[PDB]
Design a protein around this ligand. Structure first.
Ligand SMILES: Nc1nc2c(ncn2[C@@H]2O[C@H](COP(=O)(O)OP(=O)(O)NP(=O)(O)O)[C@@H](O)[C@H]2O)c(=O)[nH]1
Ligand SMILES: [Ca+2]
Ligand SMILES: [Ca+2]
Ligand SMILES: [Mg+2]
Length: 166
């Protein structure tokens, strides 16, 4: 069966782990335990193909920025996550997209932009602003909530579909 190596990146606290755990384990993690580097595996059927997803959940706390480079090198596609109630996390995306281009040494890496926490009441990043950033990179934008599970499968499965176009 086909294996896809996916990496989830973005600032601290935006919900990378909650998104991943919703996908893999079908529950919402309410507490905040910062991640170092965790890996998950799951067999799924996507568009009639039996796939193995190997997901690397990375640290957003900038103390681990150096260790991240070597883990990210093996990734085939990246989920770049910000939170729609955290303007700085959106402004930080550009940096993660530069780190990816450095570790992969390529300008054409499969990637999806994810605006998480779309259940939150205090939105400061409008959908149009994120669509414009995604358009500049040539990638899809999807909004998610790890809390309600909205968009979670869509975000990960769209990333697989992007890997398949490359
Ligand atoms: N309301 C809401 N809260 C969320 C959502 N996703 C994550 N959270 C909450 O935000 C906090 C941080 O989530 P977490 O997934 O640990 O963030 P992270 O990006 O993995 N942090 P780190 O980079 O430090 O590992 C948790 O309290 C979690 O419940 C969401 O979609 N909606
Ligand atoms: Ca819970
Ligand atoms: Ca985490
Ligand atoms: Mg504004």
């Amino acid at each position: 069966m086909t294996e896809y190596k996916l990496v989830v990146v973005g600032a601290g606290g935006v919900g990378k782990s909650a998104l991943t755990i919703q996908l893999i384990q079908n529950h919402f993690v309410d507490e905040y335990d910062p991640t170092i580097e965790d890996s998950y595996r799951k067999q799924v059927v996507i568009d009639g193909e039996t796939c193995l997803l190997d997901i690397l959940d990375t640290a957003g706390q900038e103390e681990y920025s150096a260790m991240r480079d070597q883990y990210m090198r093996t990734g085939e596609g990246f989920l770049c996550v910000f939170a729609i109630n955290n303007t700085k996390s959106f402004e930080d995306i550009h940096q993660y997209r530069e780190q990816i281009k450095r570790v992969k040494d390529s300008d054409d890496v499969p990637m999806v932009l994810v605006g998480n926490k779309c259940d939150a009441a205090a939105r400061t990043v409008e959908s149009r602003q994120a669509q414009d950033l995604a358009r500049s990179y040539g990638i899809p934008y999807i909004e998610t909530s790890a809390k309600t599970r909205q968009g979670v499968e869509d975000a990960f499965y769209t990333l697989v579909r992007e890997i398949r176009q490359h």
